[PDB]
């Protein structure tokens, strides 16, 4: 056995299944969708007392931003690809990239890696969070599958966040962004958080104003 | 090839051994001169059988010695020739031993790195010009030396060489230490010109080392 170029007698591919056994080591990240806004928090793991923790969040385009949670190198490669692709898009058509066209494209890249034997499947799964008009959250399993979402949490002990998601409607209190973000920080619980929707595009409130916002879960 | 759980590379560690079991060679160094001297065994009847062992001249101002596979050595050396000529073309000025040690190292490494190629089986050492000597292991590392010995049982020659080491010396007398460390493949890089030392010329010295050890 031992290559993704062949199926198991069960009918399963093991190699691609191992990608989730990669992703579980990664730190949890969570996302919430207000009707006109999307908020995506991460969790920046700190390797040492003197390390500054890495940022899970990125910013592929004006209103598009992402939060990969798997092995970092594949993640950065997907970012460089998705960015080069959005820019190719605008450069061709004097127009912002369709979000779903992008998701469909990156997912095409995953499958192109997870089908061919010589290229290993990615050990990462993006959680895209954006809109070309109305707010969206896509997830890409380390394969050609991708799903739209209302709310998504993934990585390490994301299990707490998952079971917690049921406790709130994704938009049980959509109307205020502060309600939204407080749902985000509850759902997840330096650590990162980022905001995108309506007038302001993608944004990363990692400011000390965020540090002020942190006490609000306990305020 | 591929890392073992220790993270050591196997094909390289195996590759060294062909040098760890091959004909000894050494170099002794100084200001404007250096003595490169190797050793190669051949059938007595056939005087012409190894005119090939003889220390290579990569450039008029450069010189090399090696230990390990000859079949691989001819390849590496030719790549070195083509490259010193390339640099000497693109600059209109001769290749410094530094840059060529760097190039050769980049090669031996490259084969260890990129797929599709068996790693080298040889260890090289190079004299050029002031004058300074660079040894290059199969791993792709290289290092300046004041004195060193490649080949089978390099450690006896070399660690005994440490017992006898002295830096700048005479044009002729600096030769003697090579023998004291080391038939013989003698060559002398001097005046930025490699030279194939006369057979008879050393014969006098060839006598004394034969007998100072005896008497």
């Amino acid at each position: 056995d031992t290559d993704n170029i062949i199926y198991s007698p069960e009918g399963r591919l093991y190699q691609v299944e191992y990608a989730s056994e990669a992703i579980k080591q990664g730190t949890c990240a969570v996302a919430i969708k207000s009707k006109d806004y999307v908020v995506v928090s991460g969790l920046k793991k700190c390797i040492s007392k003197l390390s500054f923790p890495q940022e899970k969040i990125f910013k592929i385009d004006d209103y598009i931003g992402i939060s990969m949670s798997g092995i970092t190198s594949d993640a950065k490669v997907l970012t460089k690809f998705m960015q080069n692709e959005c820019l190719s898009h605008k450069f061709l058509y004097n127009e912002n990239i369709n979000i779903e066209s992008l998701v469909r494209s990156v997912a095409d890249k995953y499958q192109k890696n997870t089908q061919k034997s010589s290229k290993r499947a990615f050990g990462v799964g993006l959680m895209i969070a954006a809109y070309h008009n109305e707010p969206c959250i896509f997830e890409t399993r380390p394969n050609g599958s991708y799903f739209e979402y209302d709310a998504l949490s993934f990585g390490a002990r994301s299990h707490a966040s998952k079971t917690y998601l049921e406790k709130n409607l994704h938009l049980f209190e959509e109307c205020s962004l502060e309600e939204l973000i407080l749902h985000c920080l509850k759902a997840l619980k330096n650590t990162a958080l980022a905001v995108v929707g309506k007038n302001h595009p993608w944004q990363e409130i990692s400011s000390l104003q965020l540090e002020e916002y942190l006490s609000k879960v306990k305020m | 090839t591929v890392f073992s759980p220790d993270g050591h590379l196997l094909q390289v560690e195996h590759a060294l051994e062909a040098v760890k079991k091959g004909g000894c060679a050494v170099a002794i160094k100084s200001s404007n001169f250096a003595v490169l001297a190797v050793e190669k065994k051949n059938i007595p009847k056939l005087q012409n059988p190894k005119t090939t062992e003889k220390l290579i001249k990569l450039d008029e101002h450069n010189c090399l010695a090696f230990a390990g596979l000859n079949a691989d050595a001819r390849v590496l050396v030719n790549k070195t020739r083509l490259e010193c000529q390339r640099y000497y073309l693109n600059m209109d000025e001769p290749a410094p031993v530094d840059y060529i040690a760097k190039y050769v190292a980049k090669v031996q490494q490259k084969f260890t790195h990129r797929g599709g190629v068996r790693p080298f089986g040889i260890a090289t050492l190079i004299a050029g010009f002031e004058i300074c000597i660079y040894q290059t292991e199969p791993s792709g590392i290289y290092a300046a030396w004041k004195a060193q010995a490649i080949g089978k049982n390099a450690k006896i020659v070399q660690e005994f060489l440490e017992k006898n080491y002295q830096e700048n010396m005479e044009q002729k007398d600096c030769i003697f230490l090579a023998l004291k460390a080391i038939n013989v493949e003698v060559a002398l890089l001097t005046e930025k010109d490699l030279t194939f030392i006369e057979e008879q010329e050393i014969n006098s010295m060839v006598e004394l080392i034969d007998q100072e050890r005896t008497k």
Binding site: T2, D3, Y14, Q15, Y18, A19, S20, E21, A22, I23, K24, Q25, I47, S48, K49, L50, S51, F52, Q54, I71, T72, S73, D74, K76, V77, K80, K119, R120, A121, G123 | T1, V2, F3, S4, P5, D6, G7, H8, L9, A105, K106, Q109, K110, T112, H113, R114, G115, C132, S139, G140, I141, A143, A144, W145, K146, A147, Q148, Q158, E162, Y165
Partner: protein, 217 residues
């Protein structure tokens, strides 16, 4: 090569970790006034030309990068990094921001055989010195203070013992000399170290003259 382990870690690249443990140690410390950069120079054999072999290098004029693990794979990554982080400045004067030079080197380091080396690239580009360790795994990270080599296993604590942001680069030099002299067998001399620095002002990469390190000790 890239046969994912059932455990979920990549096999190969996780086998390749140990190569840095073969590394002789080096301690880079970003500081408010620069980046200090020390390493073992006692690696030397008695008969190699004395102190004629540098672990610490210079990718660009204002970047300096101590290396772990195999000397060869490091020589390559430094070669391509010199090429690229120079090529960045092809007509416009600004040299590549350290974070992005290092981002290049890592983004290549991802994808033959995985490199056996880790780097500790430092430099001043933004108003403030940068200190970036690159793991062989392609993971890239900005320490304030950090060390490499196997001696970094326990020596790292020593940084935690002393690292305050507020130091004259000279104070930082004392500090890194402390932590690195501790792991050496020889009493430290200029033959035991190959220290380099990039100032917050001078921003120029400069290996110390032996007279200097002989003076501080």
């Amino acid at each position: 090569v890239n046969t994912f382990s059932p455990e979920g870690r990549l096999f190969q690249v996780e086998y390749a970790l140990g190569a840095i443990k073969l590394g002789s140690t080096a301690v880079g410390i970003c500081v408010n006034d620069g980046v200090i950069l020390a390493s073992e120079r006692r690696i030397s054999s008695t008969l190699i030309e004395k102190d004629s072999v540098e672990k610490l290098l210079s990718i660009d004029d204002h970047i300096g990068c101590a290396m772990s693990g195999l000397m060869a794979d490091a020589r390559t990554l430094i070669d391509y990094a010199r090429v690229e982080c120079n090529h960045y400045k092809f007509i416009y004067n600004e040299n590549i921001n350290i974070k992005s030079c290092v981002e290049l080197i890592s983004e290549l380091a991802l994808d033959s055989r995985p490199f056996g080396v880790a780097l500790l690239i430092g430099g001043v580009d933004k108003n403030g010195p940068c200190l970036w360790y690159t793991e062989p795994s392609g993971t890239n990270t900005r320490f304030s203070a950090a060390s490499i080599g196997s001696a970094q296993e326990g020596a790292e604590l020593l940084l935690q013992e002393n690292y305050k942001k507020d130091m004259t680069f000279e104070q930082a030099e004392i500090l890194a000399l402390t932590v690195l002299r501790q792991v050496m067998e020889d009493k430290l001399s200029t033959s035991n170290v190959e220290i380099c620095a990039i100032k917050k002002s001078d921003q120029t990469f400069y290996k110390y003259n032996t007279d200097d390190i002989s003076r501080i000790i």
